[PDB]
């Protein structure tokens, strides 16, 4: 009925997939998704055996679109190795700054995903599913929970779904302000009604995650592709884009670019025709001083030549792209990244929950010119220093990005020494 | 001696009803109790922990892990203002300067009448639209102070 106020993010498609309906602003609701074949990939896939979805998941190539870029089918293969029950987790926490490509299917096309939740449970025998979206997407949350009914009513949730033996029921939880959440371990830690501490890993989830069970945990755009695998059969997912990297791609878009938004584009597409062919180039045509792809990298004017793709030389990460220009401060922008693993580390690691912290410090001192030698020394020290013994992802790369700043704008830092 | 509303002690139920295990409905029910007083009253986690089956320290431990939360100031409405990367490139200082001019608040701050309170907040999930905000639930770009003060009078 109605939903919270939701701004309207451009969206853009070449390939007319996961934005197909998402490209228009709006809640598409079950009818809608019914009449361009919605919920027909589930009724095959639940007359297709759960290893075989996994062979075809597997065979398309699909990989984590959660960042880290992981095989999604191997995943799978992974926790149907174990013995049951199993649990299947949507995640839909997304945090990482410049990163919104989750939320407009959630909020625009929630069916997209739901139809890739089922198949995915049905996939790795689940017969209990999560959606566990972080607490400041309220609309999100509303939206999830009207669709999840209207599927009941459809008959494509529930005992004995359209007559398969099949039992799924999907149960949506809301975050409360913690980036940390949306890290697997601490998102089931959370779901378990904790706070939001990460395990160390091994073990992966797929071996013991939520109540100690396998389970699967993925991301609303990896699952989000679930649907177009069963439908189109793997062969054709993978004859979408490059042949390495299949499959269709959203990329967050923001800062200094003319048109800001999400784009569903294939792989092979490079960074310079991310911002410049697809969203209309910088404003006032001023040059590209950095990119960040989040808060994990920074890429300078001199690589926008790379493919968005999961390969070694390729941009990677979520596809989350900021454009900063040239006369964007990269100290004042690498100070807001610090604030950011200042406000977000859980603490359970000693040189993340200071290293986090004194990152931020010291480095408002520098920016402020208020640094002393040793504060200077100190920042460059403790940048180094924050991953020692960390458990999981925020503290091995809380000083990825200001390290990439200061190797790639020694020139502009060298000033603030000054 | 303190309890809940009939009203709300309902829609607390349904949450704790709502997953398999009760303890799993913590943050919905942290939500709830927030959106119902405008803030989590102290009192409140004695009750909350019983009918979660969890002990109080653990319900504690919660709350003050989970930075939506909010212990100390009652308000009716949060304005919550992103200060990350790319809110703060886009303006985020213009936003916080034309709230300050129509509310006479800074961040952390709440006005006289309890009416609104500025939360500064990291990264919204909406970063093409930057500078962002939410009014409680609401989510919207910021174009000017006279956009915002339209925006602000539907908050009454
Ligand atoms: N979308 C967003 O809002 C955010 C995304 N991220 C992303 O998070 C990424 C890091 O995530 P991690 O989970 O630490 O990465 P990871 O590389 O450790 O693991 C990736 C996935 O593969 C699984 N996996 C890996 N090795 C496995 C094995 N041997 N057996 C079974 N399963 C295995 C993990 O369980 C996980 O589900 C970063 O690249 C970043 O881009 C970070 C913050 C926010
Ligand atoms: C600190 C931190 C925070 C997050 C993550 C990692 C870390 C280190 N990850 C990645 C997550 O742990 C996991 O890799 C994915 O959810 C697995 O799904 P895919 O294989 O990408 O589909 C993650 N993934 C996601 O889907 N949404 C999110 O918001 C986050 N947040
Ligand atoms: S590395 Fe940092 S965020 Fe991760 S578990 Fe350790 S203290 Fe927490
Ligand atoms: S940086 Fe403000 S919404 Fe992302
Ligand atoms: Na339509
Ligand atoms: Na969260
Ligand atoms: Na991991
Ligand atoms: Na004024």
New interface residues.
């Given amino acids: 009925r109605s939903y ?7 969206a853009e498609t070449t390939l007319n997939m996961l934005l197909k309906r998402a490209k228009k602003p709006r809640v598409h609701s079950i009818d809608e998704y019914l009449k361009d074949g919605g919920y027909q990939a589930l009724e095959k896939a639940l007359n297709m055996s759960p290893e075989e979805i996994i062979d075809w998941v597997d065979k398309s190539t699909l990989r984590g679109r959660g960042g880290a870029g992981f095989p999604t089918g191997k995943k799978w293969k992974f926790a149907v190795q174990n013995p049951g029950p199993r649990y299947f987790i949507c995640n839909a926490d ?7 490509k989750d ?1 407009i299917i959630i909020e625009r096309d929630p069916h997209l995903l739901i139809e890739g939740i089922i198949i995915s449970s049905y996939a790795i025998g689940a017969n ?1 599913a999560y959606i566990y979206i ?6 999100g949350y509303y939206i999830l929970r009207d669709a999840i009914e209207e599927a009941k009513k459809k008959g494509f949730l529930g005992k004995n779904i359209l007559g398969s033996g099949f039992d799924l029921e999907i ?1 949506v ?7 940390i959440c949306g890290e697997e371990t601490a998102l089931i830690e ?7 501490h990460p395990r160390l890993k091994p073990p992966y989830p797929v071996q013991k995650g939520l109540w100690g069970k396998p389970t699967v945990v993925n991301n609303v755009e990896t699952i989000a592709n679930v649907r177009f695998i069963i439908s189109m059969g793997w062969e054709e997912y993978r004859y979408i884009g490059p042949s390495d990297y299949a499959g269709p791609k959203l990329f ?5 670019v003319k048109k ?3 784009y569903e584009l294939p792989m092979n597409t490079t960074l310079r025709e991310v911002i410049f062919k697809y969203a209309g180039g910088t404003l006032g045509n001023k040059k590209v001083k950095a990119v ?1 792809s989040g ?1 994990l990298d920074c890429f300078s004017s001199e690589e926008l030549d790379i493919p968005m793709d999961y390969s070694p030389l390729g941009f990677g990460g979520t596809g989350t792209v ?1 454009v ?1 220009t040239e006369e ?1 401060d990269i100290v004042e ?1 690498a100070l ?2 610090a ?2 693993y200042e ?2 580390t859980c603490g359970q690691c000693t040189p993340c929950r200071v290293g986090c912290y004194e990152q931020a410090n010291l480095l408002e001192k520098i920016y402020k010119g208020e640094a002393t030698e040793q504060d200077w020394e100190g920042f460059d020290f403790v940048n180094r220093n924050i991953q020692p013994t960390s458990i999981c992802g925020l503290g091995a790369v809380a000083g990825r990005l200001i390290r990439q700043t200061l190797e790639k704008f020694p020139e502009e830092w060298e000033k603030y020494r000054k | 001696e303190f309890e809940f509303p009939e009203e709300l002690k309902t829609k607390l139920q349904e949450h704790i009803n ?4 009760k ?6 029910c ?2 709830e109790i927030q959106n119902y007083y405008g803030y989590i009253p102290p009192e409140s986690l004695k009750p909350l922990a019983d009918m ?1 089956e ?1 002990p109080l320290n ?1 319900v504690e ?2 709350v003050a ?5 909010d212990r100390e100031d009652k308000a009716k409405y949060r304005i ?1 203002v992103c ?4 809110c ?3 303006g985020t200082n213009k936003l916080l300067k034309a709230l300050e001019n129509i509310l006479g608040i800074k961040p952390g701050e709440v006005t006289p009448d309890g009416k609104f309170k500025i939360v500064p ?10 500078p ?1 905000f ?1 009014v ?6 910021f174009e000017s102070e006279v956009q915002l003060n339209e925006i602000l009078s539907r908050y009454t």
């Fill in positions: 919270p106020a939701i701004p309207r993010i451009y997304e945090s990482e700054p410049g990163t919104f939320r209990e972080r607490g400041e997407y309220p609309a149960y939880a809301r975050g409360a302000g913690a980036y959370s779901l378990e009604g904790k706070r939001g967050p878009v923001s800062g200094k800001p938004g999400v960040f808060a900021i900063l964007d922008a807001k990244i604030e950011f406000h977000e | 709502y997953f398999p295990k303890r799993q409905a913590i943050l919905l942290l939500h979660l969890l653990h431990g919660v892990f989970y930075d939506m939360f919550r200060v990350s990367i790319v703060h490139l886009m907040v990291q990264c919204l999930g909406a970063c093409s639209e930057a962002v939410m409680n639930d609401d989510e919207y770009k």
